[PDB]
Amino acid sequence: KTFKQRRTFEQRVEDVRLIREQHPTKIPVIIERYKGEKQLPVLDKTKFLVPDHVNMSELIKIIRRRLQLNANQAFFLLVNGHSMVSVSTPISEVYESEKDEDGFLYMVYASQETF
């Protein structure tokens, strides 16, 4: 069901190394809907290559546009399993401190703060 269940640890490590080789300026991001989520739709894919200069505030705007949300729909994003302390941090800095041992950066979205 989840990305980690679909691909082996060895397969996930190797896909991050291929992104380092072929898209060296991109952050490898896994974005998944909270398994309780009723209101928000699913994304068209799971694995995203994010330009390393964008901050978390801009990534939230990108994901709202990808999901085709309207102005009043609530959206909450966890990174590495927890709330973001700040949305102003460049994703290169977020990646270095919150990356998974496989080298992906894991995000989960819900319509409620209570995941």
Ligand SMILES: CNc1cnc2ccccc2n1
């Ligand atoms: C951490 N060790 C490695 C080993 N081989 C690699 C090949 C391509 C890109 C990154 C790589 N990193």
Ligand SMILES: [Cl-]
């Ligand atoms: Cl690149």
